[PDB]
Design a protein around this ligand. Structure first.
Ligand SMILES: C[C@@H]1C[C@H]2[C@@H]3CCC4=CC(=O)C=C[C@]4(C)[C@@]3(F)[C@@H](O)C[C@]2(C)[C@@]1(O)C(=O)CO
Lengths: 10, 242
């Protein structure tokens, strides 16, 4: 899971 | 939406720059990239809760952030330059402000001059915070893939709503009509600038090891996906004029 993915799906 | 944008506006990020250290291009460029990484975490947090953006599929959200990160970063830089220095300097962070001297030492003098021209325009227009926040959203939705996004219709609906939102802002006539024309011409001028910034960014990213120009994980992931798309012609810039 990419950092963009993590930050958008918190 | 204007009241929402005011509340979700990200706080200032410090570069952690030490002014008593040598002004080499490697040190300057590495500091700015580490700063970009910290700034982008806030940018993504700001994007996540934007009215309408939260309704785009995650894949379209990623595509839009990867295409627009450079535009949002340069526009926010010019905003801080205008608000903290009246566009006399490039206010990257409170502890890292570029004058002509730092511009020459960064090895990106002409690109710094290009980013400064936008700050100069903000002084000329006397840009308001409200206008700035809507323009930032329009920059987030300023580039799409050549074949469009997964939810192209949802995208076009959101973007039209933010264009209408900008028109509603400037109508607060004649002067309001000229203002909408000037703010949308300013948005289009970001495409030419960002194209030159990304060219140098892609070069330093490829030549990271030889140049000793560090990139934080946030920028490594974004640029690794973005660079092949831009270079193959997959990016499609959206314009108000031309
Ligand atoms: C010319 C490019 C464009 C630069 C960027 C221009 C916009 C910007 C504004 C900021 O407030 C902080 C960082 C960034 C986002 C930036 F200043 C740095 O990251 C360094 C950068 C990518 C660059 O200098 C490099 O490629 C260095 O490797």
């Amino acid at each position: 899971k990419s950092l963009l993915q993590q930050l958008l799906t918190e | 939406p204007v009241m929402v944008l005011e509340n979700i506006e990200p706080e200032i990020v410090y570069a952690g720059y030490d002014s008593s250290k040598p002004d080499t291009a490697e040190n300057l460029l590495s500091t700015l990239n580490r700063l970009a990484g910290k700034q982008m975490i806030q940018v993504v947090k700001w994007a996540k809760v934007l009215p309408g953006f939260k309704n785009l599929p995650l894949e379209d959200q990623i595509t839009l952030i990867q295409y627009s990160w450079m535009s949002l970063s340069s526009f926010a830089l010019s905003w801080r330059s205008y608000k903290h220095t009246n566009s006399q300097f490039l206010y990257f962070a409170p502890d890292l402000v570029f004058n002509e001297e730092k511009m020459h030492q960064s090895a990106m003098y002409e690109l710094c001059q290009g980013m400064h021209q936008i700050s100069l325009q903000f002084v000329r227009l006397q840009l308001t915070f409200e206008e700035y926040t809507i323009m930032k959203v329009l920059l987030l939705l300023s580039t799409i893939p050549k074949d469009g996004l997964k939810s192209q219709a949802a995208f076009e609906e959101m973007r039209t709503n933010y264009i209408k939102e900008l028109r509603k802002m400037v109508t607060k006539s004649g002067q309001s009509w000229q203002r909408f024309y000037q703010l949308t011409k300013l948005l289009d001028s970001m495409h030419d600038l960002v194209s030159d910034l990304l060219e140098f960014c892609f070069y330093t990213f490829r030549e990271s090891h030889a140049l000793k120009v560090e990139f934080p994980a946030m920028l490594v992931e974004i640029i690794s996906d973005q660079l092949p798309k831009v270079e193959s012609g997959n990016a499609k810039p959206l314009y108000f004029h031309r």
